[PDB]
Write a protein that binds this ligand. Sequence first.
Ligand SMILES: NC(=O)C1=CN([C@@H]2O[C@H](COP(=O)(O)OP(=O)(O)OC[C@H]3O[C@@H](n4cnc5c(N)ncnc54)[C@H](OP(=O)(O)O)[C@@H]3O)[C@@H](O)[C@H]2O)C=CC1
Ligand SMILES: CCCc1nc(N)nc(N)c1C#CCc1cc(OC)ccc1OC
Ligand SMILES: [Mg+2]
Ligand SMILES: [Mg+2]
Length: 225
Amino acid sequence: KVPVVGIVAALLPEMGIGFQGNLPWRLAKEMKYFREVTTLTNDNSKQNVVIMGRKTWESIPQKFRPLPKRINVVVSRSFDGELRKVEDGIYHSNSLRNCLTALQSSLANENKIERIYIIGGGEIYRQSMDLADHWLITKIMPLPETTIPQMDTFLQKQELEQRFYDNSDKLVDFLPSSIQLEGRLTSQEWNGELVKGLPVQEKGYQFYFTLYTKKLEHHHHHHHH
Ligand SMILES: NC(=O)C1=CN([C@@H]2O[C@H](COP(=O)(O)OP(=O)(O)OC[C@H]3O[C@@H](n4cnc5c(N)ncnc54)[C@H](OP(=O)(O)O)[C@@H]3O)[C@@H](O)[C@H]2O)C=CC1
Ligand SMILES: CCCc1nc(N)nc(N)c1C#CCc1cc(OC)ccc1OC
Ligand SMILES: [Mg+2]
Ligand SMILES: [Mg+2]
């Protein structure tokens, strides 16, 4: 019942997301977007969840974690159960899938979660293609002068485009009401792909905030008792 949204910043065209356990760039405006989108809710009485892999957790600066004003869940196969409170603001789960089921119980969650954001792991994103209802993808491009950063972790673009379509026309409507974005909706060709969304420039990069949504599904079967 609660929307599950993967959120990620990726450098085109390979959609690289990381290098040696860290981000390949440092972009304050992209950081600001991530913070505001994952924090803010339309309903003042709710929070969002942010679910992450152990390795992503370990890579967030210690002064900045857990991420304020959001329910943090860290997943590790060495943890004890599906969803366990370990400290203020911090849950542990030994299962991405079972933690989502647990978070979705109206009984457990009192309908006071607005959205569940999956905020990474490369490994976590790989497993999320079949779990996410949408993706918020910041598509990053080095400006002509700009050296492409080295990268070793990538979003599965093939799986993305199999399952989801570019719904960035609806990005503004989709984001929490009180967020304010600088750009206007723009469509630009870049190395032979259409890049559509809300543009920003910072340091060596231009980037677009985009929204991907699940493609329509045929009706093959509905479970009957
Ligand atoms: N650009 C962006 O928008 C973002 C980029 N990143 C980047 O991604 C990289 C980190 O990604 P990656 O190395 O893949 O690691 P992840 O952050 O995806 O963490 C992987 C770990 O999560 C645990 N795990 C994986 N699947 C499950 C599951 N189904 N249930 C329970 N636990 C599970 C395992 O922990 P364990 O080994 O303890 O069992 C595994 O080693 C970094 O470079 C980081 O900078 C991260 C977030 C955002
Ligand atoms: C700094 C926002 C980037 C970001 N951007 C987008 N579009 N999606 C995301 N999921 C993240 C993310 C993340 C997790 C993260 C947070 C962080 O400080 C808060 C430091 C390192 C991080 O991962 C290595
Ligand atoms: Mg535990
Ligand atoms: Mg699992």
